[PDB]
Amino acid sequence: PLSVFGDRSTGETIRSQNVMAAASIANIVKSSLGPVGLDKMLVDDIGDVTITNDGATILKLLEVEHPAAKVLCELADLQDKEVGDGTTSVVIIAAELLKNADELVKQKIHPTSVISGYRLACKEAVRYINENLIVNTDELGRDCLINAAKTSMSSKIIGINGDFFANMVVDAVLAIKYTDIRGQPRYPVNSVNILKAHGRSQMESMLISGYALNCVVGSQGMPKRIVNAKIACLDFSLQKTKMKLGVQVVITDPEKLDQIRQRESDITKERIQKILATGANVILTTGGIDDMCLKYFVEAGAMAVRRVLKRDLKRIAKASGATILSTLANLEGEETFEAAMLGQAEEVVQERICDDELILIKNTKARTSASIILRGANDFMCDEMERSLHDALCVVKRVLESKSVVPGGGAVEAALSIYLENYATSMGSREQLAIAEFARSLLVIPNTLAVNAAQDSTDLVAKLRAFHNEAQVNPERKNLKWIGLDLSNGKPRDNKQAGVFEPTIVKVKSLKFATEAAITILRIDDLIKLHP
């Protein structure tokens, strides 16, 4: 009777199908959660291999057909973009929320009541986290940043290497620190250039007190080391001058051809001489350099690097104090270059890294920058180290921006579950059930953590819940809020004492995003799939 060219699913069928898709996506990455988690090795059916633990990478690499599962995949991508950590936790929480909400719906509870209860539970969980489960980093110091970095790098290929990698990440983050207007210290991550190269062990990874360029000098005649560098950053190619489309050369007197041809290169020669007359030693350009200008720079005993990436050039200019020059033209209509446009650095060296060479700009003046050279055993391990390092850098940035941290190891989840189970009894009659199921769904994180360690999940979570219930009931034993999970021995442990920390923004954003994803999926009770 509908006569719609397609397939239609209505009622419990489509809801169960959506829950199945979400649960399958959750189960894909549920085995890579927590320090006792293990990585996955993906194959791109063309021989490409990717070994990773990051949830966002796993969900982006996979091709997904069901749209409710695409919702969770792009939810993980959003969590990665806006926070940088907690990518698997948000997916797992959203799937568990959807599963319990579908159970409520199948129990003839209207989805609107479930959604209202979920909204109330999310709001109250955020409020409780902000008011009871935050530790200021002011009284902790650098140890807080070190512990946050170590916690972030757990469950990663640089886990035991954390004692060194946390120091490296903290130094790299603090190097690029700057304050904008309103006196707000903003830490601009992604300005730390991450260079990878297989070779020596992970302990041999070097943190550059400057900038590292993945490019070499254009000519072998130029020196490979300049002590007192005067960096000149350019945004135009240094080649033979060629007239534009609107200009055409027509010769009627044959005597002018030689002069025309000579000027065609003398223009660039004069530009090079003007640039070099100010004492410039290192010349960096985003465009290309032909052999003629390369020889000009060779004769002057100066650096010259072509095809420099735009972001690298911008970072180098900002750090060294140089100014990007897309053209040589002052406000007088002339063509001049002055020494005020030159950046300075304490040393520029072309170093050798495992049969390949790269340029190191060491100790830029007027601004401090940083870069990290990751040494590994092969390409895949270097890629995984880069991803884990990016996660750690994002975590450190979040901790330094907002000075609130939360206990790790599922302590927050258990405290929230206990508080919300207590709180649900004071609101409604069916939204009561929705909030109770939200509280129960929040328990999936410690359960997964315990399961991944081959520990007795039931007993450990029961003990954690008992500790948090005692903390919430007794007002003279509030120090038990920090009791989390110690997966090394499978016992409850004060994670704040043990130094297991996460940024509060991670938990807050994960909860909000998971709640919206669950609400979005739960609103569907019918599906029409048109035939292509």
């Binding site: 006569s3 060219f5 690029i176 700057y178 304050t179 904008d180 207007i181 903003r186 601009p188 991550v189 992604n190 300005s191 250039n193 991450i194 260079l195 990878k196 190269a197 297989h198 993945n214 070499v216 990436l309 972001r311 911008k314 970072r315 900002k318 750090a319 890294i353 495992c354 390949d356 790269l358 601004r367 920058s369 390409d379 270097c382 890629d383 880069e386 990016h390 035939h531 292509p532």
Partner: protein, 195 residues
């Protein structure tokens, strides 16, 4: 047997579902056959001489340092060159040009050398017309080379490279990085100072 003039009614409307169900498959088959016939029948029916640079090109070359046929060309950018390879196991001559394409792919990453059997995709094309260097650019056939063994032999990568370059089909050729540099590309919040 009269009353031919009918103008019918909503009866065909009542059967639009099955009509379109069959017509979508028929249209897919027609598209596959049209892409197959663009080459078949259309082409099946019809001392400087010593190349002193051949040896140096050879020695630098070794410095290594059914529905799929439709779908891999329907998508992706039209600005890149795709050189489809046709082969059948057992008949000699396929391995040499397969190795030639493998060697060529090293120095021409822009090209998209791919191979596909004749069985998955005619009888006269299978008996004695297996070796075909189908070159697709922009979604249409730019190179429709068949019987390439006569002008190649039974030939290294230099011969195929020269044969393709003499007709201006090979893209112009263009260092070894450590492994990689890039990790992302967005508003990365470059350095600032503010005073």
């Amino acid at each position: 047997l009269a009353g031919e003039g009918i103008s019918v009614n909503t009866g065909p409307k009542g059967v639009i579902n099955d009509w379109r169900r069959f017509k979508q498959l028929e249209t897919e088959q027609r598209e596959e056959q049209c892409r197959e016939m663009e080459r078949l029948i259309k082409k099946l029916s019809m001392f400087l001489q010593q190349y002193r640079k051949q040896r140096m090109e050879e020695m630098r070359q070794q410095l290594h340092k059914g529905e799929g046929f439709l779908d891999m060309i329907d998508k992706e950018q039209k600005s890149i060159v795709i050189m489809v390879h046709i082969y059948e196991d057992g008949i000699p001559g396929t391995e040499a040009m397969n190795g030639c394409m493998i060697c060529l792919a090293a120095e021409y990453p822009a090209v998209k050398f791919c191979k596909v059997k004749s069985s998955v995709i005619s009888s006269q094309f299978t008996r004695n017309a297996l070796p075909a260097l189908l070159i697709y650019k922009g979604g249409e056939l730019i190179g429709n080379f068949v019987r390439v063994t006569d002008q190649l032999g039974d030939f290294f990568a230099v011969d195929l490279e020269a044969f393709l370059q003499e007709f201006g089909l090979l893209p112009e050729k263009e260092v070894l990085t450590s492994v990689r540099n890039s990790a992302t590309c967005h508003s990365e919040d470059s350095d600032l100072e503010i005073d």
